Amino acid sequence: AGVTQTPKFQVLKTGQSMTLQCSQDMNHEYMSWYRQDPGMGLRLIHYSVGAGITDQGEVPNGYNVSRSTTEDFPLRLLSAAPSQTSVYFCASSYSIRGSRGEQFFGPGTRLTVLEDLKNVFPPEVAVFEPSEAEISHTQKATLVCLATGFYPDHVELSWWVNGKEVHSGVCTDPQPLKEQPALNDSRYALSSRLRVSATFWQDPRNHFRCQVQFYGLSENDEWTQDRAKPVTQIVSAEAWGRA
Amino acid sequence: RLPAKAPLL
Amino acid sequence: MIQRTPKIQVYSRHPAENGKSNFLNCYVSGFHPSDIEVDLLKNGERIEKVEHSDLSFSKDWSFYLLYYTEFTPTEKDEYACRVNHVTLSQPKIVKWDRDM
Amino acid sequence: AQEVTQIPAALSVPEGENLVLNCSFTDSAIYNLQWFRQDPGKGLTSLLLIQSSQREQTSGRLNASLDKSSGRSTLYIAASQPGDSATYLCAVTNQAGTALIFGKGTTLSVSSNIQNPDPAVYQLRDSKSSDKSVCLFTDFDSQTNVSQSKDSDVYITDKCVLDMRSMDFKSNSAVAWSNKSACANAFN
Amino acid sequence: SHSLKYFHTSVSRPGRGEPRFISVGYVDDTQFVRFDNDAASPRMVPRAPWMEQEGSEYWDRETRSARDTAQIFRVNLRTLRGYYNQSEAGSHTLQWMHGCELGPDGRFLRGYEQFAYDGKDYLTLNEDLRSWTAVDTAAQISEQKSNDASEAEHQRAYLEDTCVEWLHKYLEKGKETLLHLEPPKTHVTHHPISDHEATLRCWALGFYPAEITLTWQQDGEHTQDTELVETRPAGDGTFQKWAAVVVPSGEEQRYTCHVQHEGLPEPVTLRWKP
């Protein structure tokens, strides 16, 4: 149940038309579209109070919606502009006014609009082994993952220990770095840490891999350049534990 | 001046 | 659903003087639903430059409309109001009487 | 129109401390006030909903109050934990009562208390190359702020805390690295 | 006793898109704004001369409140069809009436709100303005929904506060028109209907406000039943009315017409004279 949104990531060339998908299976009369910018949080784009009924929000221009069914409430970009680079959230509620007021949000759609897709690159990933100085002084081993030279900021970093995704002894930078902030098109770098006990790293049959899921161009996204198509792909660096 | 709200029946 | 038939009054704004420019009024009231055709007629012919008030209603929820036009009453010319409503089997025509 | 403001906009506090997030709105004529939490890279999950007719709503360490007349809502967070760290968004019904209007949110950071700080800078080499190196500053206090690089060849990251629950142990860490052929001062 | 009122009408037209929606405002018996749904860009526009001066802020606001009401009234019409288990093919009517009255002191005297469905009472805001009265058992589901949503609270706040504030502003803007008492010009006319009977018609012309009392009496007391005509607009802001009594021919001068109007310092007595 709850609210569904596709896609999760999307790159567009300026002027391209694209429909952001949203649905809910809770028979909710009330659905809405919001955009979240690092500045000034959530602004309403369009809203619906039932099937066949739609109206403008706070920032409606550049966007169309339709409510043919209670289930679906798609958001259409007619002609994509860089200013429409944002995160887009679909929301539903059984009621707006009554006690059943609980509003449910979708997972969100990250969208960046570029004039040129030629500045789109996937990440290069490197795993850096723990320090002897750390293993001696603290009896602990810190692995540092480093994703570099990716554009746009469309990456998900995760750690894989003996083939299983880990969610403990790990922290990834909240924001990535612009490798050259002076440039506006600047490629990005992102670092993440995995700390285990010295004994776990000293174990020669322990496998460590940091994985970066990159979201770039899709199939049928024109690519002409003397370089591999920077498409959605997983890029990873690995290292075995050793005494 | 109009009321901002109309009751939902 | 309840259905109420239009009460039709056809009259002049000011007391009729032959040749003196006046205003011809057709007031339809006490009717439901709101869907209603109203035409002012000169000598059986519908008049084109005819205005009407915005749809409003009385305490009993019955609707009233004022259809009006500028007119110069002559001794020979006959004016009337033609109203079609779901209540009426055929359109109802009401002659303008100067003493009403 | 309806304008929603959230005071403060950013708040950083040590764990165990009580703290308040506020929500003010220009139009007192609302049906419902709603508090949401937003974990990074994810959507909003509704914490609490207060009807116009209600004065407060409790949910564990979270109590939200509603002062319609003054046009205010206060979310009290008792004994703050690192797991509370998120962006907290407030929303009220619009004038027509057909959709929710959101404030710009409050960024909350509840800092983990490092009981035995042991500040140290470590040099890490690549598991593929040799020349490829990284510097790691770790085991430092939560009230330590890692200063900016201010060089376009030398990069330094903001700190994050990792939880080694296996050894019931927390540790802050920031990363520094460059393409030039010294960790020593890098973190200063 | 001055009043600010609005009359809202929504008529569902199945297959032909959204319902028709018309909003009209009144100060006393003088219309001053209107919103009609039938247009590509429908707006709240002035309908009195004294309302032309107000700014985009006012019209943009009044337009938004009006089109927001139309949208809610479209959901209301869907909901009411469901309550009565009616065909989606049929056209149905939702009417909404609300106003605030000033007392002699010029302060809030009372507010009122009613909904009707298909020209019949449905839901009524009670005198306290904090509870509703369902006339049908269908309106009961609406009462429980409104109480759950505390609708009556936001209406009370408008009727007691916003409504009173703006009624004052409207009464100031073109008081030349609104505060002027216009007495009726009154005369009796005579129309033989049969050999043995004649109609005596008592006329009241060009009067404002609409409120007026026309009654027929006979000297030394059998007066027949007065035919009272629905009060009608002249189209210039003043109103017209007549009261007729069928009377034996020759006895017309026995009957007196009595006219009471705010714009007459004392009541007027008329008698037909040949």
XYZ file of C-alpha atoms in Angstrom, chain C residues 1-2 4 7 9 11-14 25 27 29 32-35 52-64 66 99-100, chain E residues 7-9 11 22 24 26 31 34 47 92-93 95-97 114-116 118-119 121 191 201 203 229-235 240:
64
model
C -36.786 16.865 -6.615
C -39.390 19.686 -6.174
C -41.906 25.241 -9.171
C -44.230 33.641 -12.124
C -44.270 39.882 -14.804
C -43.674 45.803 -17.271
C -41.855 49.120 -18.031
C -39.333 50.786 -15.615
C -41.163 54.188 -15.925
C -38.636 44.360 -18.037
C -39.128 39.388 -14.177
C -39.356 34.343 -10.123
C -36.901 25.605 -9.737
C -34.707 24.282 -11.250
C -32.671 27.314 -12.545
C -32.555 26.230 -16.274
C -30.355 39.719 -17.828
C -29.482 39.945 -14.064
C -27.112 37.399 -12.372
C -28.906 34.197 -11.132
C -30.046 34.792 -7.478
C -32.776 33.132 -5.284
C -35.313 33.949 -2.487
C -35.633 32.596 1.136
C -37.565 29.504 -0.201
C -34.605 28.717 -2.618
C -36.845 29.699 -5.631
C -34.844 31.545 -8.380
C -35.462 35.060 -9.828
C -34.671 40.109 -14.617
C -51.740 49.109 -16.765
C -49.518 46.323 -15.214
C -26.356 33.524 -2.835
C -24.360 30.558 -4.323
C -25.895 28.161 -6.952
C -26.041 22.931 -11.057
C -22.956 31.359 -9.907
C -23.889 36.945 -6.235
C -25.843 41.781 -1.781
C -26.258 43.489 -5.709
C -20.967 38.343 -9.091
C -22.000 44.793 -10.296
C -29.093 18.380 -9.497
C -28.930 21.766 -7.629
C -27.697 26.325 -3.133
C -25.710 28.093 -0.324
C -27.033 31.212 1.523
C -28.153 27.310 4.952
C -27.567 24.656 2.254
C -30.451 23.386 0.049
C -32.871 20.358 -5.301
C -34.670 23.445 -3.833
C -33.669 22.645 3.058
C -60.056 47.919 -14.037
C -54.888 47.951 -7.808
C -49.316 50.829 -6.841
C -47.746 40.579 -6.529
C -44.083 39.464 -5.949
C -41.937 42.648 -5.405
C -40.021 43.281 -8.691
C -36.952 45.400 -9.621
C -37.413 48.502 -11.889
C -33.802 47.847 -13.119
C -42.159 48.133 -7.737
